[PDB]
Amino acid sequence: TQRIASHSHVKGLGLDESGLAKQAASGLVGQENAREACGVIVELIKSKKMAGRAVLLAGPPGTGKTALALAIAQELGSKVPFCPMVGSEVYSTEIKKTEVLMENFRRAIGLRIKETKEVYEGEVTELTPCETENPMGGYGKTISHVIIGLKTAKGTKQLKLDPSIFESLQKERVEAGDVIYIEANSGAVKRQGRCDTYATEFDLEAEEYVPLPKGDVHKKKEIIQDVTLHDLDVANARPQGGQDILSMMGQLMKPKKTEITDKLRGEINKVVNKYIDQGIAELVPGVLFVDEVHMLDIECFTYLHRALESSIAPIVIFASNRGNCVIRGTEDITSPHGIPLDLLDRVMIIRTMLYTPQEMKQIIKIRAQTEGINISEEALNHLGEIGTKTTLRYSVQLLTPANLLAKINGKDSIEKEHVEEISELFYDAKSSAKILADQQDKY
Amino acid sequence: TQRIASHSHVKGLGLDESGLAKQAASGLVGQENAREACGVIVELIKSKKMAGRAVLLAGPPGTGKTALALAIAQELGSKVPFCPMVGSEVYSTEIKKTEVLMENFRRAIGLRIKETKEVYEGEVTELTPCGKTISHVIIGLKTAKGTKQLKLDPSIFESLQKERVEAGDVIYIEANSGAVKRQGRCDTYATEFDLEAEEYVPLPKGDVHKKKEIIQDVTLHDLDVANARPQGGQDILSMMGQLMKPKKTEITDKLRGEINKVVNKYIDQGIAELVPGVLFVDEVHMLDIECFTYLHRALESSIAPIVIFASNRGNCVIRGTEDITSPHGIPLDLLDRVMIIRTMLYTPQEMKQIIKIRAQTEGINISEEALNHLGEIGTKTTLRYSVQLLTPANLLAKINGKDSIEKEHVEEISELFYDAKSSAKILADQQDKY
Amino acid sequence: WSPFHISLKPYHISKFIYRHGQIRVFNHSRDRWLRVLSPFAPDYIQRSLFHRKGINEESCFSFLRFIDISPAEMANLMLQGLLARWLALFLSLKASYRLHQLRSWGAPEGESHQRYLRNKDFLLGVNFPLSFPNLCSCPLLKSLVF
Amino acid sequence: DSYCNDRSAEYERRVLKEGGSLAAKQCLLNGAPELAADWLNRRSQFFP
Amino acid sequence: DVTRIERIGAHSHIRGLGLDDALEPRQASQGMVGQLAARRAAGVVLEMIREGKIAGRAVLIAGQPGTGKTAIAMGMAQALGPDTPFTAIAGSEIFSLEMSKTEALTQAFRRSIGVRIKEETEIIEGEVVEIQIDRPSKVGKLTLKTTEMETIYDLGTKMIESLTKDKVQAGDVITIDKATGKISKLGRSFTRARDYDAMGSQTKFVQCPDGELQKRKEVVHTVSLHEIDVINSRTQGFLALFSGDTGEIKSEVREQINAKVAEWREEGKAEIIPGVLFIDEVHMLDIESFSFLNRALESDMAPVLIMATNRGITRIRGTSYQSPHGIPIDLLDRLLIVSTTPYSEKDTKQILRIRCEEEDVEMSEDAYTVLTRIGLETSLRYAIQLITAASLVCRKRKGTEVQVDDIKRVYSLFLDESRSTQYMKEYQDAFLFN
Amino acid sequence: DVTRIERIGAHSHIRGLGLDDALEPRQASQGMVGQLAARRAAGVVLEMIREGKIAGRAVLIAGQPGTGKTAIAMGMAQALGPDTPFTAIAGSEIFSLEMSKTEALTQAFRRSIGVRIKEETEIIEGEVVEIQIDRSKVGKLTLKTTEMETIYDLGTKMIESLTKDKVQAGDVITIDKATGKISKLGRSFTRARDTKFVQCPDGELQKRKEVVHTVSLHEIDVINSRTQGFLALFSGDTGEIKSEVREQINAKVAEWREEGKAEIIPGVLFIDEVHMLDIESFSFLNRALESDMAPVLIMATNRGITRIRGTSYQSPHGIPIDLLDRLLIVSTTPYSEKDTKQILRIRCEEEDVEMSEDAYTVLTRIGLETSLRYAIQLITAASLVCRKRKGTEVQVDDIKRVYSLFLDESRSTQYMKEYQDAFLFN
Ligand SMILES: Nc1ncnc2c1ncn2[C@@H]1O[C@H](COP(=O)(O)OP(=O)(O)OP(=O)(O)O)[C@@H](O)[C@H]1O
Ligand SMILES: Nc1ncnc2c1ncn2[C@@H]1O[C@H](COP(=O)(O)OP(=O)(O)O)[C@@H](O)[C@H]1O
Ligand SMILES: Nc1ncnc2c1ncn2[C@@H]1O[C@H](COP(=O)(O)OP(=O)(O)O)[C@@H](O)[C@H]1O
Numbered sequence A: 001t002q003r004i005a006s007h008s009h010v011k012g013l014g015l016d017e018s019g020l021a022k023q024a025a026s027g028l029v030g031q032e033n034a035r036e037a038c039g040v041i042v043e044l045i046k047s048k049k050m051a052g053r054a055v056l057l058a059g060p061p062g063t064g065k066t067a068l069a070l071a072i073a074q075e076l077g078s079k080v081p082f083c084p085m086v087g088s089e090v091y092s093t094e095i096k097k098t099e100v101l102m103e104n105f106r107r108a109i110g111l112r113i114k115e116t117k118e119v120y121e122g123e124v125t126e127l128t129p130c131e132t133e134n135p136m137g138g139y140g141k142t143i144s145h146v147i148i149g150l151k152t153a154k155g156t157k158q159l160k161l162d163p164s165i166f167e168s169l170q171k172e173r174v175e176a177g178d179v180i181y182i183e184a185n186s187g188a189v190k191r192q193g194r195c196d197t198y199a200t201e202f203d204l205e206a207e208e209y210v211p212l213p214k215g216d217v218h219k220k221k222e223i224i225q226d227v228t229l230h231d232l233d234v235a236n237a238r239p240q241g242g243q244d245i246l247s248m249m250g251q252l253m254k255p256k257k258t259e260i261t262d263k264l265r266g267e268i269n270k271v272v273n274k275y276i277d278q279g280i281a282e283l284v285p286g287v288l289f290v291d292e293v294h295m296l297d298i299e300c301f302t303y304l305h306r307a308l309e310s311s312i313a314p315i316v317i318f319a320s321n322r323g324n325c326v327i328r329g330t331e332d333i334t335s336p337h338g339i340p341l342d343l344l345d346r347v348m349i350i351r352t353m354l355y356t357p358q359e360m361k362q363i364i365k366i367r368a369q370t371e372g373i374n375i376s377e378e379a380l381n382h383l384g385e386i387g388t389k390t391t392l393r394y395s396v397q398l399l400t401p402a403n404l405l406a407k408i409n410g411k412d413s414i415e416k417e418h419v420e421e422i423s424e425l426f427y428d429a430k431s432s433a434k435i436l437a438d439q440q441d442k443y
Numbered sequence B: 001t002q003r004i005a006s007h008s009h010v011k012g013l014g015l016d017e018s019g020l021a022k023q024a025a026s027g028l029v030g031q032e033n034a035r036e037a038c039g040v041i042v043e044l045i046k047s048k049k050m051a052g053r054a055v056l057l058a059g060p061p062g063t064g065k066t067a068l069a070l071a072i073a074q075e076l077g078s079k080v081p082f083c084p085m086v087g088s089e090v091y092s093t094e095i096k097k098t099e100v101l102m103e104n105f106r107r108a109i110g111l112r113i114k115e116t117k118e119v120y121e122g123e124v125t126e127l128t129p130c131g132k133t134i135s136h137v138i139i140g141l142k143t144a145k146g147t148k149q150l151k152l153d154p155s156i157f158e159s160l161q162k163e164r165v166e167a168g169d170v171i172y173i174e175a176n177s178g179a180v181k182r183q184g185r186c187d188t189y190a191t192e193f194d195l196e197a198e199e200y201v202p203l204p205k206g207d208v209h210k211k212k213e214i215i216q217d218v219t220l221h222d223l224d225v226a227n228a229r230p231q232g233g234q235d236i237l238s239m240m241g242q243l244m245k246p247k248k249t250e251i252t253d254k255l256r257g258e259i260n261k262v263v264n265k266y267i268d269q270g271i272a273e274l275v276p277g278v279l280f281v282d283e284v285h286m287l288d289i290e291c292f293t294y295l296h297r298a299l300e301s302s303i304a305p306i307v308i309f310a311s312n313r314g315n316c317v318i319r320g321t322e323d324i325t326s327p328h329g330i331p332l333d334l335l336d337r338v339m340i341i342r343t344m345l346y347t348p349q350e351m352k353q354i355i356k357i358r359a360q361t362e363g364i365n366i367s368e369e370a371l372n373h374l375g376e377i378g379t380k381t382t383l384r385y386s387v388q389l390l391t392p393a394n395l396l397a398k399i400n401g402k403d404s405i406e407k408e409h410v411e412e413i414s415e416l417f418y419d420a421k422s423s424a425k426i427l428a429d430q431q432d433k434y
Numbered sequence C: 001w002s003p004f005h006i007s008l009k010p011y012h013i014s015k016f017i018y019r020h021g022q023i024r025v026f027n028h029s030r031d032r033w034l035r036v037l038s039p040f041a042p043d044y045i046q047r048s049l050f051h052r053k054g055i056n057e058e059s060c061f062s063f064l065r066f067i068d069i070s071p072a073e074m075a076n077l078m079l080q081g082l083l084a085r086w087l088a089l090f091l092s093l094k095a096s097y098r099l100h101q102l103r104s105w106g107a108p109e110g111e112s113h114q115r116y117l118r119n120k121d122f123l124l125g126v127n128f129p130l131s132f133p134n135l136c137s138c139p140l141l142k143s144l145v146f
Numbered sequence D: 001d002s003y004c005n006d007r008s009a010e011y012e013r014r015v016l017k018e019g020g021s022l023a024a025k026q027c028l029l030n031g032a033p034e035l036a037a038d039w040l041n042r043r044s045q046f047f048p
Numbered sequence E: 001d002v003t004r005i006e007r008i009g010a011h012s013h014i015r016g017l018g019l020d021d022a023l024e025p026r027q028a029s030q031g032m033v034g035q036l037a038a039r040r041a042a043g044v045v046l047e048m049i050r051e052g053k054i055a056g057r058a059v060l061i062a063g064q065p066g067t068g069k070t071a072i073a074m075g076m077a078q079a080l081g082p083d084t085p086f087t088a089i090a091g092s093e094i095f096s097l098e099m100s101k102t103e104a105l106t107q108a109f110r111r112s113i114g115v116r117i118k119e120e121t122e123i124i125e126g127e128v129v130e131i132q133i134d135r136p137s138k139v140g141k142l143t144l145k146t147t148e149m150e151t152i153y154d155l156g157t158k159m160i161e162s163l164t165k166d167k168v169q170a171g172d173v174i175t176i177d178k179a180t181g182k183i184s185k186l187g188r189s190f191t192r193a194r195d196y197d198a199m200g201s202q203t204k205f206v207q208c209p210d211g212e213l214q215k216r217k218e219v220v221h222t223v224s225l226h227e228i229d230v231i232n233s234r235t236q237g238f239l240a241l242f243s244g245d246t247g248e249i250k251s252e253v254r255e256q257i258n259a260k261v262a263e264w265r266e267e268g269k270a271e272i273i274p275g276v277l278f279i280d281e282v283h284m285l286d287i288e289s290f291s292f293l294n295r296a297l298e299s300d301m302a303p304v305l306i307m308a309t310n311r312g313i314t315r316i317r318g319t320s321y322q323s324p325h326g327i328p329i330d331l332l333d334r335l336l337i338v339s340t341t342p343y344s345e346k347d348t349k350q351i352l353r354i355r356c357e358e359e360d361v362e363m364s365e366d367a368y369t370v371l372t373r374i375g376l377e378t379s380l381r382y383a384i385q386l387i388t389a390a391s392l393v394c395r396k397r398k399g400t401e402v403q404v405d406d407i408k409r410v411y412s413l414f415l416d417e418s419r420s421t422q423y424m425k426e427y428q429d430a431f432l433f434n
Numbered sequence F: 001d002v003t004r005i006e007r008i009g010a011h012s013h014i015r016g017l018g019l020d021d022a023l024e025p026r027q028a029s030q031g032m033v034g035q036l037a038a039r040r041a042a043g044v045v046l047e048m049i050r051e052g053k054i055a056g057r058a059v060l061i062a063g064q065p066g067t068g069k070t071a072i073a074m075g076m077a078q079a080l081g082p083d084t085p086f087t088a089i090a091g092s093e094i095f096s097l098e099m100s101k102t103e104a105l106t107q108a109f110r111r112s113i114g115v116r117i118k119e120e121t122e123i124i125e126g127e128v129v130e131i132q133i134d135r136s137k138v139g140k141l142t143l144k145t146t147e148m149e150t151i152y153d154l155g156t157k158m159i160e161s162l163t164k165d166k167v168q169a170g171d172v173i174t175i176d177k178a179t180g181k182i183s184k185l186g187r188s189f190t191r192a193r194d195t196k197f198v199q200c201p202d203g204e205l206q207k208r209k210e211v212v213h214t215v216s217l218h219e220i221d222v223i224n225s226r227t228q229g230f231l232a233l234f235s236g237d238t239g240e241i242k243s244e245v246r247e248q249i250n251a252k253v254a255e256w257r258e259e260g261k262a263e264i265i266p267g268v269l270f271i272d273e274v275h276m277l278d279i280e281s282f283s284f285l286n287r288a289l290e291s292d293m294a295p296v297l298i299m300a301t302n303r304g305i306t307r308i309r310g311t312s313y314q315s316p317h318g319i320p321i322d323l324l325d326r327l328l329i330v331s332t333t334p335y336s337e338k339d340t341k342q343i344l345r346i347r348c349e350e351e352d353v354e355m356s357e358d359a360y361t362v363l364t365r366i367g368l369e370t371s372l373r374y375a376i377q378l379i380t381a382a383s384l385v386c387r388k389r390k391g392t393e394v395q396v397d398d399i400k401r402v403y404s405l406f407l408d409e410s411r412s413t414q415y416m417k418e419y420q421d422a423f424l425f426n
């Protein structure tokens, strides 16, 4: 079964139909105004009206801003792209900072486009070039068509084909008892190998045999294929399927990202609009979640001023835990949240708040019953108390090690005497710093 | 003859059989307490048991730190790898700093292999291949000491064909390597035409066939580098080798793992033997704090060579910290992983002996009255400066038609070439002009 | 008009350096050991791959069993130089179309009561919607990669 | 280009000016040795 | 006898992490002494690693120099054993010159998760005795030997071609995989090592195979999740496993691999083995790299992290800010901190005893007593370094057991930091730069 | 007159560091004057370079700007002559983008030490008189010198070579017998009618010649790096040569020395403007100057006690004491009026200009009021003013014209302070 992580319980925002928050629902507890706010943002993303609008979740360490951002992705579900990033990802060795941001802005926009596939396949039982009764004038013989007899686990039938197929059927080393396929939209033929039926005809042969096709000789299906605009950017900027020196040299060489030009972005925008107009393809504008924003550089922020104002951009969600820090890439310029004031003017802030002693107790129970652990009430009333003296993360951190110690001492549930033993093994940030300060001459 | 250079007089540590130092021996003088310590390090490297153990030589400029480090390489001799490097070598433009450390740590460990080198050479008397396709090829060879026949495999035959060998050519085959070399046509056929483009050589006067026992030295680093990137395979003759320029690259951890596992196989089979050697990271205070921290890992590893460090700094700032001072310019965290040997300044009588040993190494005759003067000037300046004046003094003695340095020669040279101390006094006076 | 055309005099190398001076030649006996002690010799690959002692026991080259590659192909590709690479690449392009048909229609049910990876099962790159095989197979995505 | 005054050296450089081997030269010039072999007879195919 | 490639080092005697079945630490076992509280904690996290139920966990080990932090991690790695990945790096290794600090950390994570797969095989492996072919399509037969049996195959057309391409002959040892069809030479039989006397540039001699000629079985392969990412980076990407030359794997590839591995564990085709990542000297990760760990420790598949550090309250690299351990507070509360304690005289004796047992040395009880004082007046690590030197002095003296006088000789030759830095002040103006 | 590439520049008049056989520096010779102490000292170092026995030795030339401390090094490079390697670089030239900073110094050492060999060749040289071919092929030719004739039968590979190069009767040609290369030297004067013309050779047709040849130690290293390494000896792409290759080549050249198959020719590295190497680069020269295959190196500098690059530390010459103990310092001194006047005379001779004795006098005073290089620049300008005026000799009023047009730095600084706020960023 799947492993457990620091957000595995977050299943949604947990709202009424009226859009008011519930005290505890879909794995979340508390933060009601911030959850109500994210409710509005989910409707904004589902509306498909808007571009470039952005929100900053602001609040101290361990208050739920990452959890809430993840919850929005649950409300939207799998069909619309949600792209996570951290501020520290922009500093690549291959490519400039502003290109990393621009790629991510194009990852968070999807196409869904749908098309038929048709193919013929089977073991070839016969190749029967068919002559006309008389040749054309002056000629010795004339062939009107080839018959190919294909068989599969479901049956057998003849296909009748244009004489020009015959050249291809000797470029490929096709012989009777091979299995082949023909792409019905293109007319090309490809060999797969000798059928598995014949695997016994020598003690050794230097070919891998392939099993007989199952289902009909002629196959059809409709499939829906989904791609980001960033995938179209890259596939056009470095082509594939080389039969030329430029391609093959380019494919033996070490691949590296490159600064994709604004012309290519332009041309891709022009053609996907033609397909959207013709009803061939559906756009799904998505979300970019830039976490840990306070790690971006002032050059990056000053690029975002242009990026967020573009008519194309996705919805952007930002997060930060900083107070009045200096902006990276400047010497002295302090600002709220570690962000420039003139970017912070372009975002709606959502504010996130510390938990009360009752709320922590309620979350620790939700962790235990998802991490697969049983706890007695007299132990939980100790662990929520430790949480109040220390931090939510540390009081949640003790659950699994307490369970392990309980199991080694032969019990099926955490008890008081377990948690007050684990607390003696592992310090926290607050208590460790005290130990350093009493001993500062020895580090 | 070999050129004389800055350390060519030191020939070993020159300790007696009890391990104690002699006053003056093997081209060193003085420094008993400090160079008896190198004796113990030499025994440690010869013991082969240890890995990653490390030493720091510390003391002011011109006190013998690199002389002692090179004296150790003499006492070990060419059997054992000794890799010198300068701290400043770490800052490559092709690879990360810790990669340069790790390559140099590998270079100081050697495989030592034995094989019988076997050589056939002479004029080709016949070529005859040997069913459906060539099973073997017979070849005959001749020299002025006799004739032989050999039985070649088809791989060697392909190589003869590639060299454009035919009967009457003079050939060198090396039977181990599969190496084949054409050396020209035999001069008995030199009259086949009056002008033809070949070069003709006389029939060899040596033996048709020769055997030696040889010993091959290769380090673990050579195995890493050869095996990591595809070997080019070009004896030229293949234009694809022209396109992809070489570069150094971060060797992966996985590959060094496999190389360790394959070398262990061969030293179990008796085919190879192992020599743990020495890495001498000279000028160590030029390392960065990143690199100093990585040494805390590499010196613990149960494969690493013995490492020798040397430094001349007082309480300077550690590079890359902008702030933190530490002894010898090395972080305290690392300085607690090395044993320290102190190195001491010379008394005037010591410098006189060094000057005389340099003079008779460098080839110069010097009179007692002149040697006392270079002794005095060494106390005013520095030993490394008195030893510079010997050659120019000799060259003036020679111009004035005399064999031996006399007082007026060193006295003239002293007025003509300045010291850093006395030149700095000039810069303090004419301060506004530079 | 046509550009100005020039040749310098050719770079002269002495016989002495052409005979005694290339490290490629004078160290050929020593160099052979570095190819003998290689972990890429087909001897060592077989012994590493099939003749282990633990039930669980990590060994390199285990990936070779899930790409299409044999020990002889791998040793060749490590030692023969850039031509081997070019030919191996050319064959790999031809092979990718065949893998795509099998992977995209032949998908239903496990071959084994759901055990075992098949040969070629780490070659994932064909699965992408915009891979050359798929983009050749589907007539319409071909127009978005222009 | 390099000049060296030795018969064997002159044999080597001649190979480089012609192109190192038929395989390597065909590989660059016609794309693969398979494609070189086909290209010779593509005179005789309707849809090459 | 013969010196293998691995030999006696620092963390060499620790052969696990000495614990009873109730995870009570013994006073002395598996080569460890004292540190009882940290050893219990180490036991609990080791049990957590072995279960592998929960992802992204992290522990930090903290405490003064020479108190066992890396000893406990190097002990724990052996208790855990092979078959479970454990990747160790120094903090300073992530600063690559060819990928970002993000990628160096990303790969270090993806390298500590293993996938296990079953594979169903048959292979033939033997010495070839004779290949026979005739022209009526071609028809042929081929004969294989192994020490237990000699047998024949009626091979088809494409095999006949392939054997000519690969140029097999009698006495070659070969393998084939019948499912795939591909041939592969291993070498020539020792029994045939004389049918030539000048062998090609590379041919290699092997023993003739034994047992059954066509062995059929399951095999189980474990492969690190990182390699699946690299093989999918480019058209012949596997070469980069050894070369190190792989440049910022595109994000959509790692996502695709995670999807596929999740599918295989639901199918039961594969299973995921969580391992460990150890970063020693973590205090020199940079502020951008710390902010990446804040989201690396949150994936559905991440290792457990163990990190070790020696720093007090000190400035975080890449900033002005002071913090505990030199680590940001927004990471220190995702961690869980284990603290060492300085050792007593009692522990200092026992750990020196274990080192003399590992380095194969005998000492007088007086000598252990004197050494214990030296190792308590000055660092533990200095006393550990004296014992080898004491042995080497003893051998030169023609003794056998190290006496007090052997300690005092070495203590006179090799200085610690505190004696050294004092002597550097008595002559300070002779050294360079402060 | 026709123009070389090498027109007149700032040191062109120096044609040797001029001295007598006892290394006494005469008062003016070979285009240079004054600097008695420095030129004698430079002569002693030139004798060390030429004798060659001692490796890894260095000297620092130091003193105020415009005191001949490049001049003596430029003169010494003439006096040492060709066929002993001398390499000159500015200290700012080692800061490569393509190659490490310590690699560029390592490579600069090895450009400046040479391996020398001698070898023998069978050569044909003569006028061709007849050439014949048939329908394998066999042909024949006849050759002539002033002194003898021969006919030769041709083998197949020569028939290919002669037919390829379209040799015709009356051509004068040279043939590398061993290799089949044809060199053509033009046509004989007696068949210049019916292209360059020459007289036919003397002596015999087939000469065993002997050729002495020499290669820099660097140039061995680069040829060994790649499939055709020698191209990187031009294109500059010689990126970070692997140190284990250099390790090998040194051991090979050491055995060539001892077996007598080649001999090693030391040389000079003139690293100019040394005060702007980093402390990392100094720390490498510290220890590069200890090899048996180190050249002699000569360093110039004009800096007082200053902060050494890449640090906060201060030291003489802008170089650390750590490196200054490896070397001897030769100190230049500023000029008197006599020397200044005489140097101006020598520059006038090199530039081909004449001036009045009073014109030399006023220009000498300018030279002392504003540093030599200013005065030396006035000379060319003054002659251009005279030519515009249709004069011939330079007069005092032509000098005083130019002194009012083109400023020196001291006057220009004074005329900047009166408009202080009109300039940017002061
Ligand atoms: N005890 C000695 N006996 C003989 N020669 C010595 C002795 N000590 C030093 N020398 C010589 O004097 C010079 C001293 O170089 P030394 O080893 O002191 O360099 P250092 O300043 O310690 O370190 P570095 O090599 O970094 O400059 C060399 O010529 C050396 O050979
Ligand atoms: N409102 C909430 N309801 C449930 N669990 C929460 C809530 N807020 C935080 N948590 C949990 O507490 C921990 C801290 O939340 P996180 O999103 O990482 O905080 P932050 O991003 O503010 O630092 C996580 O394990 C998270 O799943
Ligand atoms: N408890 C212990 N048992 C055994 N050896 C120990 C113990 N603690 C430390 N050591 C040894 O002492 C030395 C220093 O320990 P180490 O863990 O490397 O120091 P640090 O805690 O500063 O990283 C090593 O040789 C180590 O093997």
Ligand SMILES: Nc1ncnc2c1ncn2[C@@H]1O[C@H](COP(=O)(O)OP(=O)(O)O)[C@@H](O)[C@H]1O
Pocket (backbone or CB within 6 Å): F010, F011, F031, F032, F033, F034, F035, F064, F065, F066, F067, F068, F069, F070, F071, F072, F300, F302, F343, F372, F373, F376
């Ligand atoms: N003794 C001299 N003989 C000739 N020219 C000299 C002499 N001394 C200086 N010069 C002139 O001074 C200039 C060179 O100045 P110099 O002192 O060598 O350079 P730097 O100040 O950069 O060290 C040139 O114009 C050169 O001709």
